[PDB]
Amino acid sequence: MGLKALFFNVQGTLVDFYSTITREGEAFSAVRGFQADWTTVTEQWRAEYRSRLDQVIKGERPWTTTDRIYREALDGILANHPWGASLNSADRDELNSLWSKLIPWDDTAPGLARLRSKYITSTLSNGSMASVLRISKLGALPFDAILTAELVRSSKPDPKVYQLALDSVGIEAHQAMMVACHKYDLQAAKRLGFKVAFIARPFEFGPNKKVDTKPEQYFDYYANSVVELAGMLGAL
Amino acid sequence: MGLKALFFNVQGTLVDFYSTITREGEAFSAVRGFQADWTTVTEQWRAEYRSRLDQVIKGERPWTTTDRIYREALDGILANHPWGASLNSADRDELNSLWSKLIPWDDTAPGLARLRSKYITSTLSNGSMASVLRISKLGALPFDAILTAELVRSSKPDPKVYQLALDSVGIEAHQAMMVACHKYDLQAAKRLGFKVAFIARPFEFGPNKKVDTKPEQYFDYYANSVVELAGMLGAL
Ligand SMILES: [Ca+2]
């Protein structure tokens, strides 16, 4: 009746989406004969995705997978760059696939392996199952299971998403820990009886953007990396 | 558009529940001072389990976790054994827990690792997520995802379960292969457009029981082990 299972937020917490979109974006445009400010594209793409996802959650748009939202969001932001109209549909599919390739932080894979030697480990992502399984496979990120909010057609912080984790692994809330670099996610899990571990990710939005990494009173654990979290849990 | 993902039946195809039941049951019964015919127990237990899954599909029984199905099936078969009435509910709980501890065939883990190096791999099981995750973890069975019929509150051969596989991994039916040692499973998947691979398991019910390992014309592959299947798919 101690901690039995750890559940992980994927974007930010485990993978560096900023460096993926900006560096692969630059390689993508170079091969095609143009250049662009990919930091701006990345920010615009993320913001447009979140606005469309919000419309799904509010019922103003029909339900669809996060991969499709990313792909429709891409069409939207490309209309504000003069080179955007030069990308055909296959070009935009390839760019959209980067969200299924988000690279790990350099602590993520070894920390995850150590944690798995002691606990059941699983994602609990807001994204599509297809994208998350590929992120984990491409990153060689070990998990006992892949779960995402898509399996209950919802989004965090809907309690159904957290309960999906408990039901799927067969444990009670106090035996589960939510691990994230986003406080809204940990707040919701804590209110449902999960233990919570915060991983500080000071470069989540790139090298130059200040991120809120300060500790909070309700965190069970405060860590600077997945490797550090494994140490404090005695998973050596 | 080429094979992208393999989906595995787990009990029987990948893990040897007969050896697990006979070995655990033998120890279970020795400490209680009686002997049982564990070959017959295994046959009856799986048959009652399958009959109850069918009731879930037919709606004669509301969906419950497969571990509750195994537990109630055990109550049913224990009326056919004189020692069965000597087992209280806690005894029966202990015996039921073996369904999350099934031992892999010797070829399963190396074959699964080779296939994962070439394809996306996933379970697609009727067992609970909790049990199948734990079977895979205890047996060091590598997968890119753990899917079970629990995620759509049904059971194979319900078409919803095969669609769950395609939606979750994000591929089309012809890009997916169902792998099983049971023909009902491959027949249903083939009818939905999957490729299918049969793995012969002549000792699924021990050395004294005959099982159907004959090939069929609709099998895309017929193999005697997961390693042999990996050889056939160019994964070695
Ligand atoms: Ca896995």
Residue numbers in the entry:
A (entry chain A), B (entry chain B): 40 to 275
Paper quotes:
Microbial epoxide hydrolases, cis-epoxysuccinate hydrolases (CESHs), have been utilized for commercial production of enantiomerically pure L(+)- and D(−)-tartaric acids for decades. All these three CESH[L]s exhibit high sequence identity (>60%) with L-2-haloacid dehalogenases, which are members of the haloacid dehalogenase (HAD)-like superfamily. Studies have shown that both RhCESH[L] and KlCESH[L] adopt a two-step catalytic reaction mechanism by 18O-labeling studies.
We also constructed an inactive mutant, KlCESH[L]-D48N, to obtain the enzyme-substrate structure because D48 was proposed to be the first step catalytic residue. The first step was proposed to be a nucleophilic attack on the carbon atom in the oxirane ring by residue D18 in RhCESH[L] and residue D48 in KlCESH[L], forming an enzyme-substrate intermediate and opening the ring with an unidentified proton donor. However, the binding of non-catalytic ligands, including sulfate ions and products L-TA, did not cause significant structural changes.
